[PDB]
RNA sequence: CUGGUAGUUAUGGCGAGAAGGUCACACCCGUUCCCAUACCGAACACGGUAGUUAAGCUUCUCUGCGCCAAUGGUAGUUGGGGGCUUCCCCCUGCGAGAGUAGGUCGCUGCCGGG
RNA sequence: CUGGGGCGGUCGCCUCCUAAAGAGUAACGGAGGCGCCCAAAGGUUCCCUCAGAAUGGAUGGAAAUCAUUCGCAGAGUGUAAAGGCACAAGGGAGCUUGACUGCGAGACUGACAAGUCGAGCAGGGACGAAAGUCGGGCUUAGUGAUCCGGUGGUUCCGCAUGGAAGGGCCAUCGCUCAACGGAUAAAAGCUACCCCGGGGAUAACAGGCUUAUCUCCCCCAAGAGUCCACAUCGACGGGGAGGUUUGGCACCUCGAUGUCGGCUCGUCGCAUCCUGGGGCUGUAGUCGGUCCCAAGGGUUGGGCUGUUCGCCCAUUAAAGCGGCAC
RNA sequence: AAUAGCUCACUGGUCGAGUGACCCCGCGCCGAAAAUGUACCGGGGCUAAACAUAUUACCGAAACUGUGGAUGAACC
RNA sequence: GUCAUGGAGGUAGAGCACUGUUUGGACUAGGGGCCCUUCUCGGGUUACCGAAUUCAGAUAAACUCCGAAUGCCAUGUACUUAUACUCGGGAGUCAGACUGCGAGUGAUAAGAUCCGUAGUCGAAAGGGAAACAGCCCAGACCACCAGUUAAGGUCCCCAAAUA
RNA sequence: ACAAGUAGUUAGAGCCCGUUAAUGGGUGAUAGCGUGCCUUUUGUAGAAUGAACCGGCGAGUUACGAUUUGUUGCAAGGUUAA
């Protein structure tokens, strides 16, 4: 009466901090604003996380329990 | 300065420390290579100390 | 002893790695046995071992059970081949890691108390020690 | 000195106690006008400043709650070895969680009035 | 597909666990959902905060609504679960149709087919004073290709030419094709009358591994035994040995390891049925019981059952239990 | 049968050195029965030729080295 | 490959802040036993249950206030090393096996089955493990009546210690 | 004619020879080592398959197209078919 599972959906991180990337860039695939946007990021309409321009990703914390990722030039 | 030597098989070993003992340059068992003794160098040797030995 | 109801019916036997994270120590009676090595407890052992504990103490002091059989476990009937999913829910087990006070007992005098101990203490599969606090 | 407005994982919060006030801030008095209530000038809005520090507000004290937090030890564990292999032990590196010593009643920037 | 096959179950998609702190990851592994819904449950502006409990109040009861205090979420979020969400993504109200047309740097995911996210540009808008947000919905299911048909549109083609017929292009609709990458527009059984190609890739026999089950031996000792745990037994539980059972697995053999019982011939083990020696006894005696040593020899004629086995008749010192391809 | 009877505990005497509990660790013991033949060290055999801790010599591969030869690639 | 630096991520462990499972107190609500002037409306008792409530103590694959080691993604002006990628021509493979470690299924059975991860076999001769694909050591270009070592050994079979 | 043999191989006396004359030939007491070949397999000495032996015969070819590499000729041209 089991047997069943959906494909798994590749979430997680795409780019690493530090790394340079183009703008439109998918940083973060995600359920939820397990990250949120942060400068120059935009949060898709599935919660994708992308470069809204060319830079250096960086993860940052956003106040003792959220997190961020933005992108600087 | 270190003189490093190849003194067990390389045969039964996992690829990392394969990988390691190359980037030593160390080849056949009983190779021997000098090395300017770096923390590069250091840490490689830590990763493969059980296959090889250390001189000065 | 059976939990009252279970989120899951079936689950996994788990392992039984390093000393018991809790209940270690006396902590309500006098004396208490002590497990020396790592085993399943299935509840018809612990009833078994409460008996043979409270009849010999003849209703006089306490006896705290502190394992509990959380754990389900599963089989298969003889002339079924492996497959076709999960076998049926058995009975009940307690993990008991090394160094878990399994009973503890207050009440009487050490004599009875270790006498009550040992008779608890043969119908346990796992290797016992007697300990006191 | 106080009003505004930012930054900073609560060491910044909550709770308790106290003091202060045209220099702002506040409550406070009114519903004529703009504007309000799925009813209500409570709120929102507008016009006043008789009255008051009681509250918010600001400053000061406190470790009751939270929060932060070493060192040491332990669990676990990469790699390397052993066993008597439900598991266990040794060597090397890394090393928690809990608990504890302790820390905290914030720190920092700009602008206006004083 | 399948721990042989059949029967049963399953077949596509979504969420979780398994999954070993990136991603991915199997089993006829453990759990649930989906084949939609919504004209607002969508867009935007502005405003707001829930559950529950305590306390007091008419019908009012534990629980309706009202008021106060305490309440980081113990509520809600259309719909499983996970990840999120109180600057709310949760709740009101006003106006709206961006649930827009043309696209799209660049990424993610993927064998392919497909799938996913996307700043930004133009057209023309909605809301907003503006900033701005808006290419459906907190996110992730709600789907199905091609071929062939149907309808609508069209500065495309139109077989000498003008037309037309018909085709193309754009838009959209019609099969549980669900065995969900869909053999066809259209598809059920028996074979012991069978045949060919193959396979020890895979079952039935025997062997092997395993030992749950089985047989035997033990531990503990509550009980039984006229008193009396241990003469003889022994619950609840616990620990082994053996490899005769019931099983599990599929490792040898399908270019054949060809058969249950009986007959003939035995041989081996000892966990001993008899006979020998001994300890204990609930051993007075007789007749027994039980355990230790002991495998030298011995260990049956019939009736019924194909029957191993069993039951029965009549014997015997005894009518042992196993192994050796049962 | 009840009594009687023998014995202990508990004391002086003789004798003239040790004697009695409990806990922990090492190594052993019983528990230990299968089928052709010893048959659960490969054998012999071992009281170390076993085990523990420490040490040092040697043996031991087609490993590595020596010598000679063949050969692929790369670079001068 | 290592060093350094940065980062994503919730496993091991741990913990009980949430969710479930759970033991023993203490605490009142109540209902049910128990007696009852009573209409069981109200009292007095209870250990018969009880839902909260706190105190102490446990527990988890589908719990998490926490959280490693590793592994992963990057960066470097670091030190080693020698591959990488793109386009073409040609393939074979789609029965795997065992061992170690981490899991599931199973009985925490299987030389079982199914994944993960490393190794060896496959496609690997040699030495050791009596014999013994998959264990330990170790990779055979050819010749040598040379040498040194690995695992494993050194009383005899049998090379080396009756060290 | 006291021996346990995948039949050899390495070591090797003894005996008998004498060549394409070179660290030669025949035989082989005795010692060490040693599980045919092929197929098929995760794995075969295999108690899986195939072959009694010897000999002969016995399996990727040609045509026409496609594509790619190499060679040659000519080259913004190249080349003819019937
Ligand atoms: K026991
Ligand atoms: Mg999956
Ligand atoms: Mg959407
Ligand atoms: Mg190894
Ligand atoms: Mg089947
Ligand atoms: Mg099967
Ligand atoms: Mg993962
Ligand atoms: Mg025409
Ligand atoms: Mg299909
Ligand atoms: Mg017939
Ligand atoms: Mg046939
Ligand atoms: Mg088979
Ligand atoms: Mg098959
Ligand atoms: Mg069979
Ligand atoms: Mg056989
Ligand atoms: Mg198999
Ligand atoms: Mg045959
Ligand atoms: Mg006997
Ligand atoms: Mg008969
Ligand atoms: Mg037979
Ligand atoms: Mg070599
Ligand atoms: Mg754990
Ligand atoms: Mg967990
Ligand atoms: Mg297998
Ligand atoms: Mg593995
Ligand atoms: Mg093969
Ligand atoms: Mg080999
Ligand atoms: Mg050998
Ligand atoms: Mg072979
Ligand atoms: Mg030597
Ligand atoms: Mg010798
Ligand atoms: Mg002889
Ligand atoms: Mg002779
Ligand atoms: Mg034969
Ligand atoms: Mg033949
Ligand atoms: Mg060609």
């Known amino acids: 009466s089991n047997g069943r599972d959906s494909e798994s959906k590749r979430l997680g991180a795409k780019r690493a ?31 994708t996380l992308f470069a809204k321009t060319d830079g250096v990703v960086r993860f940052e914390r956003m106040g003792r329990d959220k997190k961020k990722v933005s992108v600087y030039p | 300065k270190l003189e490093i030597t190849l003194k067990r098989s390389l045969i039964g070993r996992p690829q990392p420390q394969r990988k390691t003992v190359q980037a030593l340059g160390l080849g056949k068992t009983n190779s021997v290579v000098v090395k300017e003794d770096n923390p590069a160098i250091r840490g490689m040797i830590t990763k493969v100390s059980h296959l090889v030995d250390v001189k000065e | 002893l059976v939990p009252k109801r279970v989120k899951y019916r079936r689950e ?104 009550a101990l040992r008779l608890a203490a043969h119908k346990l599969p796992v290797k016992t020690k007697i300990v006191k606090r």
């Open chain 1, 17 to 47: 901090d530090g790394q340079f990337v183009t703008g439109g860039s998918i940083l973060y695939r995600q359920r939820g604003t397990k990250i949120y946007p942060g400068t120059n990021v935009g949060r898709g309409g599935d919660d």
């Open chain 3, 12 to 115: 996994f036997r788990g392992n039984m790695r390093g000393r018991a994270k809790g209940g270690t120590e006396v902590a309500f009676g006098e004396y208490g046995l002590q497990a020396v090595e790592a085993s399943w407890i299935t509840n018809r052992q612990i009833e078994a071992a409460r008996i043979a504990m409270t009849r010999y103490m003849k209703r006089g002091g306490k006896v705290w059970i502190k394992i509990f059989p959380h754990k389900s476990y599963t089989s298969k009937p003889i002339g079924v081949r492996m497959g076709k999913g999960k076998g049926a829910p058995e009975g009940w087990v307690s993990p008991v890691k090394r160094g878990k006070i399994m009973f503890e007992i207050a009440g009487v005098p050490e004599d009875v108390a270790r006498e």
